[PDB]
Design an enzyme around this catalytic site. Structure first.
Site, PDB file in Angstrom:
ATOM      1  N   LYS B  13       0.869  -1.176   0.000  1.00 44.91           N
ATOM      2  CA  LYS B  13       0.000   0.000   0.000  1.00 44.91           C
ATOM      3  C   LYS B  13       0.891   1.205   0.000  1.00 44.91           C
ATOM      4  CE  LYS B  13      -2.672   0.780   3.643  1.00 44.91           C
ATOM      5  NZ  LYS B  13      -3.901   0.334   4.351  1.00 44.91           N
ATOM      6  N   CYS B  31      -0.150  14.955  -5.657  1.00 41.18           N
ATOM      7  CA  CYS B  31      -0.805  14.161  -6.694  1.00 41.18           C
ATOM      8  C   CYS B  31      -1.894  13.212  -6.152  1.00 41.18           C
ATOM      9  CB  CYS B  31       0.277  13.418  -7.514  1.00 41.18           C
ATOM     10  SG  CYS B  31      -0.413  12.352  -8.785  1.00 41.18           S
TER      11      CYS B  31
HETATM   12  S1  FES Z   1      -2.891  15.184  -9.525  1.00 40.85           S
HETATM   13 FE1  FES Z   1      -1.428  13.782 -10.361  1.00 40.85          FE
HETATM   14  S2  FES Z   1       0.025  15.038 -11.443  1.00 40.85           S
HETATM   15 FE2  FES Z   1      -1.467  16.468 -10.638  1.00 40.85          FE
HETATM   16 ZN   LIG Z   2      -5.064   2.028   4.900  1.00 41.45          ZN
END
Ligand code: FES
Ligand SMILES: [Zn+2]
Ligand code: FES
Ligand SMILES: [Zn+2]
Lengths: 65, 65
Positions: B13, B31
């Site tokens: 994970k 991200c």
């Molecule tokens: S949310 Fe993945 S590169 Fe911007």
């Molecule tokens: Zn978890």
């Protein structure tokens, strides 16, 4: 393969902001799997997702340290 | 289906931590699309992903305020 089945499809790009001085817990988990019922927070929905699909995604942990 | 084809596939994970007092700038994007070449940071890859897949995902913005 889109990654987000249902969250805020009324929005062109789903972005969330966190003013970090506003966090209150020492650790606050944020969802990166797009399955949480409390999105943008993580509610542990990634566990079922990972088992269902053989995936390995997990939350981002915001820490006060 | 799975949402992370290529990032750290050896980890059961993938979880990342951020100590919020250690942020370098006013706004830092993290991200949520699993396509960034600087994962866990966002590098703008979500845009190309959204276009190719008819998706609507985007980053988590960590703000000093
Ligand atoms: S949310 Fe993945 S590169 Fe911007
Ligand atoms: Zn978890
Ligand atoms: S519920 Fe999505 S990462 Fe935990
Ligand atoms: Zn963007």
């Amino acid at each position: 393969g889109g990654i987000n089945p249902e969250i805020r499809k009324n929005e062109d790009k789903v972005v969330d902001s966190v003013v970090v001085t506003e966090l209150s817990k020492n650790i606050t988990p944020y969802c990166r799997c797009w399955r949480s019922g409390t999105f943008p927070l993580c509610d542990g929905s990634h566990v079922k997702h990972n088992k269902a699909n053989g995936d390995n995604v997990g939350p981002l942990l915001l820490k006060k340290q």
